[PDB]
Design a protein around this ligand. Sequence first.
Ligand SMILES: CCCCCCCCCCCCCCCCCC(=O)OC[C@H](COP(=O)(O)OCCN)OC(=O)CCCCCCCCCCCCCCCCC
Ligand SMILES: CCCCCCCCCCCCCCCCCC(=O)OC[C@H](COP(=O)(O)OCCN)OC(=O)CCCCCCCCCCCCCCCCC
Ligand SMILES: CCCCCCCCCCCCCCCCCC(=O)OC[C@H](COP(=O)(O)OCCN)OC(=O)CCCCCCCCCCCCCCCCC
Ligand SMILES: CCCCCCCCCCCCCCCCCC(=O)OC[C@H](COP(=O)(O)OCCN)OC(=O)CCCCCCCCCCCCCCCCC
Ligand SMILES: CCCCCCCCCCCCCCCCCCCC
Ligand SMILES: CCCCCCCCCCCCCCCCCCCC
Lengths: 102, 162, 100, 478, 55
Amino acid sequence: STEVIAHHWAFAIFLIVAIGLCCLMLVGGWFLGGRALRLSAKFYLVAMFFVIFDVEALYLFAWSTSIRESGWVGFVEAAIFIFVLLAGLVYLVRIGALDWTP
Amino acid sequence: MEFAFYICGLIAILATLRVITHTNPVHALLYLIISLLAISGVFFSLGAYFAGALEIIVYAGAIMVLFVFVVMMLNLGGSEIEQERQWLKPQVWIGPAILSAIMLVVIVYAILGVNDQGIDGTPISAKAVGITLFGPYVLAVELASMLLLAGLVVAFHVGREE
Amino acid sequence: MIPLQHGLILAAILFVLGLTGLVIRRNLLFMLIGLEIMINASALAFVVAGSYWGQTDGQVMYILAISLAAAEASIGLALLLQLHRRRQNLNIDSVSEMRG
Amino acid sequence: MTITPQNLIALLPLLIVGLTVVVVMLSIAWRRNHFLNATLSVIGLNAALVSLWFVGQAGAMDVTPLMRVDGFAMLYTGLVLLASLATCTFAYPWLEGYNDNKDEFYLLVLIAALGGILLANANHLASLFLGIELISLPLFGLVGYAFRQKRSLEASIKYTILSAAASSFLLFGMALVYAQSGDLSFVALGKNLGDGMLNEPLLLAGFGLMIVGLGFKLSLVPFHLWTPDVYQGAPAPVSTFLATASKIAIFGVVMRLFLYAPVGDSEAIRVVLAIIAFASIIFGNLMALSQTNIKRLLGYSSISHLGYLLVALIALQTGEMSMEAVGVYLAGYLFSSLGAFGVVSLMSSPYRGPDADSLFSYRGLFWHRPILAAVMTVMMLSLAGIPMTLGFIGKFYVLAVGVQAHLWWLVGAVVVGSAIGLYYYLRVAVSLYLHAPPSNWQYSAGGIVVLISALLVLVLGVWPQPLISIVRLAMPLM
Amino acid sequence: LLKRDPLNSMMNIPAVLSRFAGKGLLLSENGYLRWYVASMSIGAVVVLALLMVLR
Ligand SMILES: CCCCCCCCCCCCCCCCCC(=O)OC[C@H](COP(=O)(O)OCCN)OC(=O)CCCCCCCCCCCCCCCCC
Ligand SMILES: CCCCCCCCCCCCCCCCCC(=O)OC[C@H](COP(=O)(O)OCCN)OC(=O)CCCCCCCCCCCCCCCCC
Ligand SMILES: CCCCCCCCCCCCCCCCCC(=O)OC[C@H](COP(=O)(O)OCCN)OC(=O)CCCCCCCCCCCCCCCCC
Ligand SMILES: CCCCCCCCCCCCCCCCCC(=O)OC[C@H](COP(=O)(O)OCCN)OC(=O)CCCCCCCCCCCCCCCCC
Ligand SMILES: CCCCCCCCCCCCCCCCCCCC
Ligand SMILES: CCCCCCCCCCCCCCCCCCCC
């Protein structure tokens, strides 16, 4: 189809011109104008929580686009998945894993 | 479609080769992110659109963020890593590289003797993936939730500070 | 019109590169990095195989593979942080006290 | 395929263990209570063990495109649940001395037991992969539960890195197999080949990489070097679980995979597995000759016993009593390892801090702990395959299966490895009786568990017919 | 000449060989994780090469 190849060309030109515009802005900024602590483990814990819950989020992303095809059985399975997710979240909050302040 | 496949595969190979031989951890992670973006382009060229989207969203957007985070927490200035360069010594890497090359030749010889009608590249959407995921692969989803729960519990138990 | 052998060869190349990085690097961080390269290469091989057969099974196995990759990265980086806390170095050859 | 209520009845131990995981998690979220959470975990595991009865009267069915429930899955589910219950029982008096949080141990044990049940029911490459990692990652936590201790952190790091590497190998092999075959079910691996073309190179390469991953998981040579270090460094109840439940579940799913796959009848795979079994038996027995540490000795013992099991596995396509031999041997090996690792765990409990060594010093054990010394010498005689013990009945089954299939090299390997094992097992057993220079009901429960294991080993050693009839009653689908 | 029982020592020869082989095999358990990974890759190469040879 002509429409899809036109849109592919437009998307390619969009990415190319955006990156080139930012590169040219940096080059013009460089060329113009004259010249002249230990991080706590809570950062790791928060990033780890983000990674784990983002994977469970991808499972829910795949479910959300095909809800009508899966029917009520898929609803029951996703309800079990979300209940396990929320039980893990409740466990994380109650044990002080998600409390930044001690 | 094939042209993007070969360029993205070449970029992934070169970036991974830069990863395994680099001394700076942040530069190595940046090359790894580049290789993951290239592999996402490979996924998009093969019609696995959900796989490429998750390759950027989760692999290059969550897991590499965790790796980068940990590298900042350590403040890795290359202490006894850059000052030695043990992996750059030929007597160190000549053995494992020969072993990996032998394994690659064996795997490639096994690969080349298989039937191949070609990959059509017809896009397999996330809707069909979610239909399979909550149909014939229900127990995979629920026990994968249990697996992520186990990873959460283990990483919380080990990675506390007190 | 992409050969299945070419995708499998790319996945195998990335797999052996990740394994080489896992072996030749004394740092635990670069070992975890090579492990991530290996599991991502295997997941790419599954995606290539699923795309050749026109089935969602390759992307489903990819999903399970990256769930494993995320949880293994979490645990490995927790153990690496514990090692850096209790030893102040990431030399994996120093962690060798059990032998024989 | 969809899920029916009958399929839900066949799902009963998996559902009960998952519900126990959620319930114990919410109970920890409510209030940290070691006794209550340990009790909830063992109640859930016992409920799954008694729900196996309803699973049996549900009949054998296919519950998913991924799971298949039959007598085979019932037997391995029961073995995994028994190992998990014993692990919790040994874990409580050990965790009584643990200063940090103790409740997460039981959560990890329950999730690993869930992985073992999934591997018992696994009929698919997806379920096999997921069950392997569902076993492995809670074991990453449990092996390094006492991460303040230096040996436990070492064992955790080694196990995590090597198991991630083996997982990558296994997944790459599965991907190559899927590229060849086009279906991930066990029965379709090699079904698209005919006229003697079963030895397709890509299918064989994929099965070789899966053999690498599974042979790591089974401590098989040459993927065995992790075993003494991880067995020594892990906490002793974790060593019990890692010796029994993980090995049993992974060997059961490997048994089912090689039974169902048409490529399991390949000659090249059989010769490679014969080489691995021969080397595993000989190497594991030889490497335990000069071990003064009971944990490393038991790790090398695990390598040898998995070699004997693999010998029984090689004759699966030829003989008819191969899986019956595997069931009898696995029951005996489970009870012997439960007794030995439980005596080690009871003598190592309570946990006496990370800065104090947990060395065993088994010499002269009879003069202060006579019942534990009797249990441990019964287990040493059982692991040696000496008659009047169930380990001999397992060794007899392995030898009969090998003689039936004319695997004479493996038969000679079993005999030679049995002699070497005789040496070091008798050394430990007689060291128990030489001369060398608790008080709660959970410790007594652990002692009751190891005593019952010793009594079962002796009674089924002299009268093995009930166990044989039970194992023959657990017939998978032909 | 026979007072030391030479046939007994001839039959004790397998025990000496077993002890020597066990001591030699225990060198692989050096406790180094990178060697364990290297041995895994060596075993993978050996298994795959054997499978392509015997196919
Ligand atoms: C500083 C620069 C860093 C690097 C930047 C990126 C490098 C490459 C730049 C040149 C790109 C050239 C054009 C690429 C192809 C564009 C068209 C395309 O993606 O088409 C494929 C597909 C079309 O979908 P559609 O047609 O609707 O499907 C129905 C079937 N026909 O559509 C898709 O599959 C869409 C999904 C793919 C879109 C990829 C977009 C770029 C992703 C990388 C962003 C990087 C951001 C900067 C760096 C971040 C930090 C590392
Ligand atoms: C040019 C020489 C090299 C220069 C340096 C590298 C620059 C980036 C090059 C890689 C990315 C762009 C590759 C070229 C894509 C051009 C568009 C194209 O080929 O589209 C075809 C196809 C469209 O979809 P399909 O429906 O299959 O089309 C068939 C027609 N009906 O497309 C697809 O199916 C997928 C399209 C590609 C995937 C999306 C973009 C991936 C971006 C990956 C970036 C990786 C990091 C790069 C870092 C560079 C710096 C180190
Ligand atoms: C929603 C769907 C269905 C879900 C499953 C069914 C409902 C589950 C409900 C779980 C309830 C958990 C909370 C129980 C609180 C008990 C409080 C109590 O009496 O505690 C006493 C004691 C506390 O410990 P201790 O140190 O001895 O205390 C000394 C101070 N008195 O503690 C004890 O002595 C132990 C008392 C144990 C009491 C509970 C025994 C039964 C547990 C049943 C559920 C277990 C899992 C089932 C799995 C599915 C089976 C089909
Ligand atoms: C007719 C011939 C053909 C048929 C043969 C049939 C088999 C039965 C008859 C032959 C039996 C021969 C056994 C020889 C070894 C006897 C065991 C022995 O000597 O043990 C004592 C010894 C430990 O004592 P010591 O020397 O003090 O050790 C110092 C270490 N700190 O222990 C050790 O040093 C370690 C002992 C390791 C285990 C024993 C050796 C096993 C070798 C294979 C056994 C199976 C037979 C295979 C054929 C062998 C050649 C005939
Ligand atoms: C401090 C500990 C360092 C351990 C480094 C281990 C390096 C192992 C390198 C192995 C090299 C093998 C080379 C190929 C051998 C022949 C091909 C495989 C067998 C057929
Ligand atoms: C072959 C099957 C097992 C047979 C029985 C093995 C032994 C079990 C324990 C029985 C009680 C042992 C008591 C030993 C007393 C030793 C006293 C020595 C004094 C010098």
